[PDB]
Design an enzyme around this catalytic site. Structure first.
Site, mmCIF file in Angstrom:
data_model
loop_
_atom_site.group_PDB
_atom_site.id
_atom_site.type_symbol
_atom_site.label_atom_id
_atom_site.label_comp_id
_atom_site.label_asym_id
_atom_site.label_seq_id
_atom_site.Cartn_x
_atom_site.Cartn_y
_atom_site.Cartn_z
ATOM 1 N N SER A 44 0.834 -1.196 0.000
ATOM 2 C CA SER A 44 0.000 0.000 0.000
ATOM 3 C C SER A 44 0.870 1.247 0.000
ATOM 4 O O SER A 44 0.429 2.315 -0.425
ATOM 5 C CB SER A 44 -0.957 0.003 1.196
ATOM 6 N N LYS A 47 1.461 3.581 -2.794
ATOM 7 C CA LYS A 47 0.445 4.589 -3.074
ATOM 8 C C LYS A 47 0.946 5.996 -2.785
ATOM 9 O O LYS A 47 0.532 6.948 -3.454
ATOM 10 C CB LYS A 47 -0.818 4.283 -2.262
ATOM 11 N N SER A 104 -6.618 3.984 1.213
ATOM 12 C CA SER A 104 -5.999 2.799 0.604
ATOM 13 C C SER A 104 -6.930 2.153 -0.420
ATOM 14 O O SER A 104 -7.085 0.931 -0.470
ATOM 15 C CB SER A 104 -5.592 1.786 1.680
ATOM 16 N N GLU A 140 -3.121 -3.638 -8.239
ATOM 17 C CA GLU A 140 -3.923 -4.100 -7.119
ATOM 18 C C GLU A 140 -4.981 -5.082 -7.621
ATOM 19 O O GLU A 140 -5.514 -4.904 -8.723
ATOM 20 C CB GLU A 140 -4.602 -2.921 -6.418
ATOM 21 N N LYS A 208 1.224 6.106 5.864
ATOM 22 C CA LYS A 208 0.445 5.335 4.903
ATOM 23 C C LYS A 208 0.479 3.884 5.357
ATOM 24 O O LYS A 208 1.538 3.250 5.322
ATOM 25 C CB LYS A 208 0.995 5.486 3.486
ATOM 26 N N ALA A 210 -4.288 -1.108 5.270
ATOM 27 C CA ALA A 210 -5.732 -1.133 5.470
ATOM 28 C C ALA A 210 -6.292 -2.512 5.149
ATOM 29 O O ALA A 210 -6.846 -2.734 4.071
ATOM 30 C CB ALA A 210 -6.403 -0.080 4.616
#
Length: 260
Positions: A44, A47, A104, A140, A208, A210
């Site tokens: 993640s 991102k 996320s 993803e 950052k 989830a």
């Protein structure tokens, strides 16, 4: 401080995993590190680098943060909390990065990857700024697979922490674009059971995180007096530990504050 290293060591034990950790003065100096050369999955934390690439195109005029992107129901993938709300009217580039960082969102992250040219262009972007370690190969949700010995979609704590400092404090991004990248991360809402639970009052934090497997990769910039002064990256390997086991170790690792 040595009392923090023992804790990262302890974490590897409690988890049965390998924990990568680095602390970096926002001077660039490596204040503490633990396996800063092991490759870890981002899953993640790319991102933040993703929108770094995006904002790199906004600054030069190659992208517009108000541009509206429209996407269909077939573009959905697991954990699309915002993109699920705007299937009809779509979203803007500014609203997708906010969905990718603060919540996320996997679809938003995919939509953004398509704007810049895919995972290879976020790789090529990292290479051209001095990060030859960090690489993205997949979209993803696949990039989270965390295959053993697999180098796809990997970084190491040393690369991520340095790359993060360049985006937030380097000449790479304009003053407003650096302010936006940290504002989104500062608006991270899916990192409560992390360093945030350890953070004292009046302290700064922008991170950052989830999901069940989500708290392995955490990047963060934090500091006293509501101003960031250091960067922290913590990656953990896959073991039989549950989400709640991992966070407590990171929360206990994070609980780094006592030896600031």
């Amino acid at each position: 401080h040595p009392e923090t290293l023992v804790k990262v060591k302890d974490a590897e034990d409690q988890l049965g995993a390998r924990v990568g950790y680095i602390e970096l003065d926002l001077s660039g100096k490596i204040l503490e590190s633990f396996r800063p050369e092991e490759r870890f999955p981002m899953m993640s934390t790319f991102k933040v680098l993703l929108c770094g690439a995006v904002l790199s195109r906004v600054d030069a005029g190659q992208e517009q943060l108000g541009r509206r992107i429209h996407y269909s129901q077939n573009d959905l993938v697991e954990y699309s909390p915002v993109t699920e709300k705007h299937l009809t009217d779509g979203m803007t580039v500014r609203e997708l990065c906010s969905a990718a960082i603060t919540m996320s969102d996997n679809t938003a992250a995919n939509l953004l990857l398509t704007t810049i040219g895919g995972p290879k262009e976020l790789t090529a972007f990292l290479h051209n700024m001095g990060d030859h370690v960090t690489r993205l190969d997949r979209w993803e949700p696949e990039l989270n697979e965390a295959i053993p010995n697999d180098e796809r979609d990997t970084t190491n704590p040393a690369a991520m922490a340095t790359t993060l400092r360049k985006l937030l404090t380097g000449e790479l991004l304009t003053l407003a674009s650096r302010q936006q990248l940290i504002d989104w991360m500062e608006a991270d809402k899916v990192a409560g059971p992390l360093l945030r639970s350890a953070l004292p009052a009046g302290w700064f934090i922008a991170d950052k995180s989830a999901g069940e497997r989500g708290s392995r990769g955490i990047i963060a910039a934090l500091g006293p007096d509501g101003k960031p002064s250091r960067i922290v990256v913590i990656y953990t390997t896959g073991s039989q530990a549950t989400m709640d086991e991992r966070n407590r170790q990171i929360a206990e690792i994070g609980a780094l504050i006592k030896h600031w």
